[PDB]
Design a protein around this ligand. Structure first.
Ligand SMILES: [Cl-]
Length: 249
């Protein structure tokens, strides 16, 4: 049978891979729908006819209350006095946007591309911004806006601490985080040039927002791998995805 069973063994493995991965994905999700809420609080309170001294603490608290959050920032249309921008030194520091606007012009909220933000010590952090229009007591008029800078790098906790077999992949297939940092901000279609059968199945699932398994010769290991991949809407509409690889052995 050694092939009848090599094939049942395969099934056994991919099943538990997807089980594990599905847990890995649940993890990373609730770490952000917690924030989007622990956030959200913030949206309603801030635009209160309260004071700059008040709101700072409000924001300075919400950063502290969300590890993977690395900064925030505030605007108010003609009340220009109310600009400010708080970031990560190891406490917060105060330092010194057609999307922010755009989502005011909506009252729907939006995200950005991943990008690298230089930080008060000098260090550059990969992250996305999450915009959040600020609106009036009646909520038919647009006040200012908020901006929460989510460190993608902060998720090495979930992604790369003591394992190195997971990948976080965001839009059109750009590796967002991975044990090897050479890959951050490069798209899978070029990292894995060698296996378009594979990257086209991954880019497809990403688009459709689903899960699958498959195999590919890895170009770093030079050996065949099993791959399980699974998606989730990063705000709680477009997908991020996590990948879990296992060398056949
Ligand atoms: Cl993304």
């Amino acid at each position: 049978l050694n092939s009848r069973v090599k094939e049942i063994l395969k099934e056994n493995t991919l099943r538990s891979m997807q089980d594990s991965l599905h847990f890995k994905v649940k993890e990373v999700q609730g770490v952000l729908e917690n924030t989007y809420t622990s956030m959200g609080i913030v949206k309603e309170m801030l635009p209160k006819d309260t004071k700059r001294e008040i709101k700072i603490h409000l924001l300075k608290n919400f950063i502290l209350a969300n590890s993977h959050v690395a900064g925030v920032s505030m605007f108010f249309k003609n009340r220009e006095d109310l600009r400010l921008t708080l970031l990560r030194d190891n406490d917060t520091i105060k330092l010194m946007n057609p999307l922010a606007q755009k989502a005011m012009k909506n009252k729907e909220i939006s995200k950005s591309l991943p990008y690298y933000r230089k930080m008060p010590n000098g260090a550059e952090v990969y992250g996305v911004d999450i915009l959040l229009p600020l609106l009036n007591e009646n909520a038919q008029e647009v006040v200012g806006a908020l901006m929460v800078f989510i460190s993608i790098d902060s998720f090495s906790n979930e992604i790369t601490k003591n394992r190195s077999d997971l990948f976080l992949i965001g839009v059109k297939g750009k590796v967002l985080l991975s044990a090897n940092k050479s890959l951050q901000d490069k798209p899978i279609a070029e990292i894995y040039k060698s296996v378009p059968k594979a990257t086209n199945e991954v880019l497809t699932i990403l688009e459709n927002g689903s899960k699958a398994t498959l195999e590919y010769l890895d170009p770093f290991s030079h050996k065949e791998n099993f791959l399980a991949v699974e998606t989730f809407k990063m705000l709680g509409n477009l997908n991020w995805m996590i990948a879990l690889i296992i060398e056949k052995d």
